[PDB]
């Protein structure tokens, strides 16, 4: 019953892997860009939350 | 000198797109605060009003011996509503409303004379005691030879009336501006309704910033004169004398 966490685990190297980070980074993604295709944010404040996340 | 209320919210919309007056946070679709909007607006129209001429106006005032004060109010004019204990004496111009009369200008005889407004001393001086009515001394009866009197002044439209039942169209209403005014009305209307929001250094002086572009904005239509203005030549060659 053991199951060895790993860095596949944890994260695969693709971007639309099922890794936990991959799966953060998008849905932090999603709730970006829902909120610049209202008129709330300009393409550079997505860029600069995304890097300082 | 009209403009559909429709296109003004419309456009109005992609400068109140921040705040409350236009947009829900989800799917920005106009609320139901257009009352407050059309009072807004109308005090923009009368702002510009005031600003420049865009209209003059015309009335006609029947004489009686012995009277001192005529006040010019919608309830002594021909087809308002006749006040008994009022003679009803305005008999012909444009209709009176209660912003209508920003200033009288020029004073004209039946037989194409001009009298004097303000000008003490002078002849046949006719005095404003309370900006809306004229006085009118004795001498002038003495030596008029004149039954009627024209009248003329700057103008400022008379707003149209709202109603809940209207509620359903709003967009039926014309305001009455030239489409110049219209860019400038932009700023007027989107200073006013952004003064008193924000908290944040760079949105906090939103209103400050609509303020001065509708400053700039009249200067250049004053600058391309887009407005009425007279420019006066005597002749000083009939007199008898000056030839």
């Given at each position: 019953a053991v199951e060895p966490i790993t860095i596949a685990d944890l994260t695969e190297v693709k971007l639309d892997g099922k890794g936990a980070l991959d799966q953060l980074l998008q849905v932090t993604r999603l709730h970006l860009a829902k909120e610049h295709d209202?008129?709330?944010?300009?393409?550079?404040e997505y860029a600069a939350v995304l890097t300082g996340g | 000198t009209i403009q559909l209320k429709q296109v003004i919210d419309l456009l109005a919309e992609g400068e109140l797109?921040?705040?409350?007056?236009?947009?829900?946070?989800?799917?920005?679709l106009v609320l139901e605060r257009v009352p407050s909007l059309i009072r807004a607006i109308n005090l923009g129209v009368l702002d510009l009003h005031k600003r420049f001429l865009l209209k003059e106006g015309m009335l006609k005032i029947q004489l009686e011996e012995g009277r001192r004060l005529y006040p010019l109010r919608p309830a002594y004019q021909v087809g308002q509503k006749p006040k008994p204990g009022v003679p009803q004496f305005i008999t012909e111009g444009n209709k009176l409303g209660?912003?209508?009369?920003?200033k009288i200008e020029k004073i004209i005889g039946d037989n194409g004379v001009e009298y004097y407004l303000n000008?003490?001393?002078?002849?046949?001086n006719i005095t404003t005691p309370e900006f809306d009515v004229l006085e009118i001394s004795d001498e002038f009866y003495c030596h008029?030879?004149?039954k009627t009197l024209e009248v003329r002044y700057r103008r400022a439209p008379t707003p149209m009336k709202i109603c809940v039942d209207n509620?359903?169209?709003?967009?039926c209403i014309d305001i009455d501006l030239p489409y110049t005014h219209l860019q400038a009305l932009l700023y007027f209307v989107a200073s006013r309704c952004q003064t008193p929001i924000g908290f944040m250094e760079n949105t906090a002086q939103e209103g400050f910033n609509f303020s001065q572009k509708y400053e700039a904005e009249c200067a250049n239509l004053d600058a391309q004169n887009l407005r009425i203005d007279p420019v006066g030549n005597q002749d000083r060659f009939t007199r008898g004398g000056w030839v």
């Open positions: 209202a008129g709330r944010l300009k393409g550079q | 797109s921040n705040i409350k007056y236009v947009n829900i946070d989800t799917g920005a209660r912003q209508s009369i920003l000008d003490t001393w002078q002849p046949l008029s030879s004149s509620l359903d169209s709003w967009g």
